[PDB]
Amino acid sequence: QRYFIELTKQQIEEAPTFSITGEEVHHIVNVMRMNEGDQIICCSQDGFEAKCELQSVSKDKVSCLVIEWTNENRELPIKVYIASGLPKGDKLEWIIQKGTELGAHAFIPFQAARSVVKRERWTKIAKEAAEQSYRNEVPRVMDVHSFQQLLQRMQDFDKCVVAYESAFSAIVSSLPKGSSLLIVFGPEGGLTEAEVERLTEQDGVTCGLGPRILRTETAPLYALSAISYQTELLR
Amino acid sequence: QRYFIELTKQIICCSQDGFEAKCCLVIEWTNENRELPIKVYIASGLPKGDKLEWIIQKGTELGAHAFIPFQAARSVVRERWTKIAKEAAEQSYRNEVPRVMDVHSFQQLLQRMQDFDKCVVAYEESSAFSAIVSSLPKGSSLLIVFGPEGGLTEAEVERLTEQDGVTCGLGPRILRTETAPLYALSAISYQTELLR
């Protein structure tokens, strides 16, 4: 039902209809087997959502007519970046997937001291979650970062919370529309005393996320969900 | 290490009545309680694959008091579930092992709603969610209903509304069937524990 088009809103407005080429055609035509007259949801590269009607359906080209510009924006009011210490098994895919459903702006995996242990599949997982959750953007998944490299990234964001153990509601409720937030989590083992020390000197502020102990795949989910509650449900 | 034992009132032990202790010889009672201020019952329409296993686990680490699996209209569908709860309780330092009830039918779900202080239906047709949770007094009961993949059905919503459940959105992004309960629980801890 929902597709990310490699055109801008103004490029789609350009002509009377527009066409879909590549990966998506196959999904439209072969996998779903849609016919002319069928309706889909398209989001441009600049975040604009449209209701489209399949005017033409070929084997490599699909033509669409925009029947409505929804004006719907479902993006979190603030940019939240998830930094995760490489978890085991396939927990990173769950973090990326639910994370996108919950509004995360980008993911940054990093080698962590207790990390006991692909990106092309991660990018794919983020795009599909992005499609199924009606995001106006597809979250970017970065390259696995050394612990050091992560430390050098910190300067780019407005704030940084370190999930470790009540600054959290304060910082989140004091961030303005459009600002950036970095949240780093440790792996199954958890961040190290040494590691916290380096994060805290880079302005990272340690915060608890409730009194219950949360798994690595669970912590970021709580965090995104709380930000949503605060910035969208109360505000 | 932390283990649940059935007797009522080095490792950590937790009585059946919820009293945590450092120990066998009991050396000290911690006095620590990490349960949510309100009793939140998670009612989810039976999902596919192993999604309900996921909900039990994550939801126990996030404070669920109890789980009520039921047959939804769009549902295409116990001992293991209980085991997943207990282990999830163990690792997260809960004081209580949430119980997972027998799978109910929709009807059974409806007959059980009167028990609760407040019933929320995770659904939006139009959000009164923060208003409700912000207003439940400590110790009260909250049942939240969630559909399976595909969602609750309009017919179903109508009958839940006849029984006093209130429809409430959970933000503007479409959440999968296993993501919704984790959001609600997280939001709840945020309101009643981090803001309060």
| Nearest to B51, CA basis, from B76, B26, B31, B34 | B76
Distances (CA, A) of A178 to A80, A155, B88: 10, 17, 37
**Residues of chain B with C-beta less than 8 angstroms from the C-beta of A135:** 173
Dihedral angle computed from the Cα positions of residues A87, B53, B72 and A229, in that order, rounded to the nearest 10 degrees? -40
Distances (CA, A) of A78 to A26, A95, A114, A135: 35, 19, 30, 14
Residue with tokens 């102990």: A213
Chain A: closest CA distance from residue B47 (Å): 16
Residue with tokens 């083992």: A189
Chain A: closest CA distance from residue B8 (Å): 22
State residue A5 phi and psi, 5-degree precision: -90, 140
**Residues of chain A with C-beta less than 8 angstroms from the C-beta of B190:** 169, 225-226, 229-230
Residue A165 one-letter amino acid: E
Report yes or no: A229 and B186 within 8 Å, Cβ to Cβ: yes
Q: How would you classify the pairing of strands B118-122 and B99-100?
A: unpaired
- The SS3 assignment for B49 reads coil
Contact B186 A225 (CB under 8 A): yes
Chain A: closest CA distance from residue B88 (Å): 10
Q: How would you classify the pairing of strands A205-207 and B12-14?
A: unpaired
User: Between A219-228 and A167-174, two packed helices, what is the crossing angle to 10 degrees?
Assistant: 50
Experimental approach was X-ray
| Nearest to B2, CA basis, from B106, B115, B95, B76 | B95
Rounded to an integer, what distance in angstroms lies between the CA atom of residue B1 and that of residue B98? 19
Report yes or no: A5 and A12 within 8 Å, Cβ to Cβ: yes
Contact A210 B187 (CB under 8 A): no
Chain A: closest CA distance from residue B137 (Å): 18
Residue A171 burial by Cβ neighbours in a 10 Å radius (0-12, 13-18, 19+): middle
Instruction: Dig out the tokens for A116 from the structure.
Output: 């006991």
∠ CA A231-B178-B3, nearest 5°, is 100
Please give the span between the terminal C-alpha atoms of chain B, in angstroms, as a whole number.
30
Contact B171 A233 (CB under 8 A): yes
| Nearest to A44, CA basis, from A70, A63, A76 | A70
| Nearest to B144, CA basis, from B39, B35, B34 | B39
**Residues of chain B with C-beta less than 8 angstroms from the C-beta of A232:** 171-172
Report yes or no: A129 and A138 within 8 Å, Cβ to Cβ: no
Query: Which resolution, in Å, applies to this structure?
Result: 2.6
Q: Choose, out of B50, B124, B190, B192, the residue to mutate when testing the contact with A (most A CBs < 10 Å).
A: B190
Chain B: closest CA distance from residue A136 (Å): 10
Report yes or no: A7 and A18 within 8 Å, Cβ to Cβ: yes
State residue B104 phi and psi, 5-degree precision: -95, 160
Report yes or no: A228 and B171 within 8 Å, Cβ to Cβ: yes
Determine the residue of chain B that is closest to A74 in CA distance. Answer: B172
Contact B92 A213 (CB under 8 A): yes
Contact A226 B129 (CB under 8 A): no
Rounded to an integer, what distance in angstroms lies between the CA atom of residue A13 and that of residue A26? 24
Contact A222 B189 (CB under 8 A): yes
Report yes or no: A137 and A4 within 8 Å, Cβ to Cβ: no
Rounded to an integer, what distance in angstroms lies between the CA atom of residue B176 and that of residue B180? 6
Instruction: Using the Cα atoms of residue A100, residue A102, residue A103 and residue A104 in order, give the sign of their dihedral.
Output: negative
**Residue B176 has what DSSP assignment?**
P
CATH number listed for the domain at residues B1-196: 3.40.1280.10
State residue A75 phi and psi, 5-degree precision: -85, 145
Contact A233 B187 (CB under 8 A): yes
A134, A166, A221: residue with CB nearest B194? A166
Q: What is the 3-state secondary structure (H, E, C) of chain A?
A: CEEECCCCHHHHHHCCCEEEECHHHHHHHHHCCCCCCCEEEEECCCCCEEEEEEEEECCCEEEEEEEEECCCCCCCCCEEEEEEECCCCCHHHHHHHHHHHCCCCEEEEECCCCCCCCHHHHHHHHHHHHHHCCCCCCCEECCCECHHHHHHHHHHCCEEEEECCCHHHHHHHHCCCCCEEEEEECCCCCCCHHHHHHHHHCCCEEECCCCCCCCCCCHHHHHHHHHHHHHHHHC
Displacement of CA A83 from its chain's centroid (Å):
12
CATH superfamily for domain A74-235: SPOUT methyltransferase, trefoil knot domain (3.40.1280.10)
Instruction: Dig out the tokens for A2 from the structure.
Output: 């929902």
Contact B92 A212 (CB under 8 A): yes
Residue with tokens 């009167």: B114
- Fold type of domain A1-73: Ribosomal Protein L25; Chain P (2.40.240)
Q: Which residues contact A193 (CB under 8 A, 6 or more apart)?
A: none
Q: How would you classify the pairing of strands B66-67 and B39-44?
A: parallel
Report yes or no: A44 and A9 within 8 Å, Cβ to Cβ: yes
Residue B196's CB is within 10 A of a number of other CB atoms, namely: 10
Per domain, the residue ranges of chain A are 1-73, 74-235
Report yes or no: A110 and A83 within 8 Å, Cβ to Cβ: yes
Contact A228 B175 (CB under 8 A): no
- The SS3 assignment for A81 reads strand
Rounded to an integer, what distance in angstroms lies between the CA atom of residue B59 and that of residue B36? 12
| Nearest to B56, CA basis, from B15, B104, B97, B108 | B97
Please give the span between the terminal C-alpha atoms of chain A, in angstroms, as a whole number.
30
State residue B173 phi and psi, 5-degree precision: -95, 140
Helix (H) or strand (E) segment spanning residue A61: strand A61-69
- The SS3 assignment for A25 reads helix
| Nearest to A129, CA basis, from A103, A92, A108 | A103
